[PDB]
Amino acid sequence: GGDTIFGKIIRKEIPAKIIFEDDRCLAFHDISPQAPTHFLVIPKKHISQISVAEDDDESLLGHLMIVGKKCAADLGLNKGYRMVVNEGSDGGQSVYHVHLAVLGGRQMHWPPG
Amino acid sequence: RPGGDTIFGKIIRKEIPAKIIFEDDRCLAFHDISPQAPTHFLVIPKKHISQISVAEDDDESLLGHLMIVGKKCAADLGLNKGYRMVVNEGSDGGQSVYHVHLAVLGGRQMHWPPG
Ligand SMILES: Nc1ncnc2c1ncn2[C@@H]1O[C@H](COP(=O)(O)OP(=O)(O)OP(=O)(O)OP(=O)(O)OP(=O)(O)OC[C@H]2O[C@@H](n3cnc4c(N)ncnc43)[C@H](O)[C@@H]2O)[C@@H](O)[C@H]1O
């Protein structure tokens, strides 16, 4: 599932602290957390960036958000959280494998970067 | 009422004005009145959902559609160098209008952390 570090994590070739898995996505704690809770939800399908997502993957993208919601509740983020998808260089995208970041456990500020 | 009681519901029903980018049967995209980047717009469902934490499992397709519409609108608006999509949830997330919204920000370098 792709030649990025996230592909390696999906294939279990390198470790990550996994929070949830199903047949089509994986959620795991970020190695460089920016909040007391900071995790990622990624599709197993290697979509490199949201700008190239296909119409057919619309429900998969929504699935990432529902999994993110559920994981956030399981991790006790009852006061709220921020979900982020970065695209390209201006977006600060650090890995070319689509990922939904979920941050909470502190006040998130505005602007969001 | 279709669209709910918030200002976003009013925007959906054309009761207060907005600068609309895209509209279909499921969602609406419009510019933010307090932009935090040179381009800053919102994508909202026409179905009222107060916040992502209460979205239903059957809302998956709709939520994904907000993301697809966001990326298509960003391309139409010339955000070729990239952008950031944000969903704020609740108090810690910085949400104040309780109608879910996906924000899309671009036209400048975005920084880390994202707030
Ligand atoms: N017509 C429009 N068109 C396009 N884009 C639009 C738009 N309207 C909003 N947007 C944009 O949509 C996005 C999402 O909005 P969002 O970020 O979710 O909320 P908001 O639009 O910023 O509304 P705020 O209440 O936070 O405004 P404020 O900063 O003045 O806080 P306040 O001092 O009143 O108070 C602080 C807190 O206390 C709450 N509060 C308000 N009144 C009371 C009260 N009497 N008692 C106790 N708490 C109160 C407030 O709700 C708030 O949470 C934003 O980017 C926004 O710019």
Author numbering:
A (entry chain A): 14 to 126
B (entry chain B): 12 to 126
Sentences from the paper on this structure:
Diadenosine-5′,5-P1,P4-tetraphosphate (Ap4A) is a ubiquitous second messenger from bacteria to higher eukaryotes, which responds to environmental stresses and cell cycle phases. Ap4A then binds to the histidine triad nucleotide-binding protein 1 (HINT1), thereby disrupting the protein–protein interaction with microphthalmia-associated transcription factor (MITF), and the released MITF eventually promotes the transcription of mast cell activation genes. The HINT1 protein is a compact and symmetric dimer, with two adenosine pockets at opposite sides. Here we report that Ap4A specifically polymerizes HINT1 into (HINT1-Ap4A)n (HAn) filaments in solution and in the activated RBL cells.
We then made an H114A mutant to inactivate the hydrolysis activity of HINT1. We also solved the HINT1H114A-Ap5A structure in a similar crystal packing state as HINT1H114A-Ap4A. The five-phosphate linkage in Ap5A adopted a bent and zigzag conformation compared with the straight conformation of Ap4A, suggesting that the increased length of Ap5A is too long to stabilize the HAn interface as Ap4A does. The negative stain EM also showed little effect of Ap3A, Ap5A, or AMP to induce HINT1 filament compared with Ap4A. Therefore, Ap3A and Ap5A are not able to polymerize HINT1.
